[PDB]
């Protein structure tokens, strides 16, 4: 009725239903795939409701929408100092004070390519930040090779933002300098919190390699951590 898409889900409700105990544990252990199947199930049930109830509401509009779920309260919140390597790719809860937030970063979803001898364009999706650019036009008539250019302003982009978080005063054991962890928020969670706010963030504790230099492919053995946020309160 309101036209929104995001569904705020509470974890405990999964433990309330006999069927979904294993689903709850899997969410806590494999958040990415579980969230994906949750999103698709939400979209499928949304379309099925209209299909079964033969309502007058337009179906094309529903088919156009990306649907999402935002789990929260997934267990006792841990501490930034207690994040060990055992938690990499696992859902965690962090309570901390915002400290800064960078401007919106354009993150690429779909690349757009155009030929220089036939003016034929086709959009190729992206997987983990790599463009599968073609070696020749998909047109049979013009099969010229290595004649693809990237039209930067015709691609598709998504909203990304990097926030810095610092722990609450009560979590400091002695009074030393509080530590800092970096976050990443995408889509409707962008600009969801202002500097100096006390927020509780639920996300996946991820880790990414760092390149040694901007020329070669050598990576430092030390991995840098961050949090991929899915819900903010």
């Amino acid at each position: 009725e309101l036209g929104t898409s995001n569904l705020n889900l509470d974890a405990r409700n999964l433990l309330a239903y006999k069927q979904t105990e294993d689903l709850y544990h899997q969410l806590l252990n494999y958040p990415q795939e579980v969230i994906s199947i949750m999103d698709q199930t939400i979209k499928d049930c949304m379309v099925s409701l209209i299909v079964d109830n033969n309502l007058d509401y337009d179906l094309d509009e529903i088919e156009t929408k990306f649907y999402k779920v935002r789990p929260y309260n997934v267990g006792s919140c841990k501490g930034m100092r207690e994040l060990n390597p055992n938690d990499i790719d696992k859902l965690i809860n962090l309570k901390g004070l915002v400290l800064r937030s960078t401007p919106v970063i354009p993150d690429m979803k779909v690349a757009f390519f155009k030929c220089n001898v036939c003016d034929h364009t086709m959009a190729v999706e992206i997987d983990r930040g790599v463009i599968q650019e073609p070696a020749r036009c998909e047109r049979i008539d013009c099969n010229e090779p290595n004649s693809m250019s990237l039209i930067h302003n015709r691609c598709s982009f998504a909203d990304k933002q990097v926030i810095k978080l610092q722990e609450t005063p009560d979590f400091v054991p002695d009074g030393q300098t509080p530590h800092s962890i970096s976050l990443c928020v995408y889509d409707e969670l962008v600009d969801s919190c202002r500097a100096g706010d006390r927020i509780e963030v639920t996300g996946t504790f991820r880790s990414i390699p760092i390149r040694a230099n901007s020329r070669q492919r050598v990576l430092k053995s030390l991995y840098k951590t961050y949090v991929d946020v899915v819900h903010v309160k």
């Binding site: 990415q32 795939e33 999103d39 979803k109 992206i126 983990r128 991820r206």
Partner: peptide, 11 residues
Amino acid sequence: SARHSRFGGLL
């Protein structure tokens, strides 16, 4: 995919 490119779901 609804989520961003770096979400990282493996099959």
